[PDB]
Design a protein around this ligand. Sequence first.
Ligand code: NA
Length: 226
Amino acid sequence: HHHHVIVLGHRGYSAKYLENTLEAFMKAIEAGANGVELDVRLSKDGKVVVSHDEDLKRLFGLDVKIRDATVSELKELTDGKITTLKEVFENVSDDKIINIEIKEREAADAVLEISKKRKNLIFSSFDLDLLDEKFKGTKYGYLIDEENYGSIENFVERVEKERPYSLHVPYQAFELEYAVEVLRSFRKKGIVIFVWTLNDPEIYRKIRREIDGVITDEVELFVKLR
Ligand code: NA
């Protein structure tokens, strides 16, 4: 028996449905997720589109950049599968969490404007300065990679100074005892710890006492591990 962990579907229920589509997001919620994580970028016409990659090559085989096409053009090319942040909000209840990963600084102002009306959002990015500069007064979470945090000491200083709502850490961070200690110190201050992108239930069991949330492709699995 364990304490409760927020389960977010990584690009929706992406193990079973096409990542970052309305279907994937709706299916994550149907499967009992507390919410979803998704990725945002700008189209040519300056609209907020949901796409992890900057182009359509990996998922559609099309050498077309998101920023080079209008929303209408993108929908035509993907036969309607690509969606906008606006459309996600229309299809996911505001009792559910949406973790919006900002992939492009230039999308930030448009994302903030559309988000004004909507609660239960967490903005995240590997661009920590962007969050600190433009996302004050919202819930934001630092995404941590091998380089961006600088030194552990500098990262601790930053988190103390800026008070992010959450820290979104790779699950591999829990392999080092000092990292575990640092994260415990953050949590004791009320910072919410999410791990990503975790699909392995054994690793989850080992670390779940240390975390507040999990970002996973395997939504039903992790919901049933509650
Ligand atoms: Na809002």
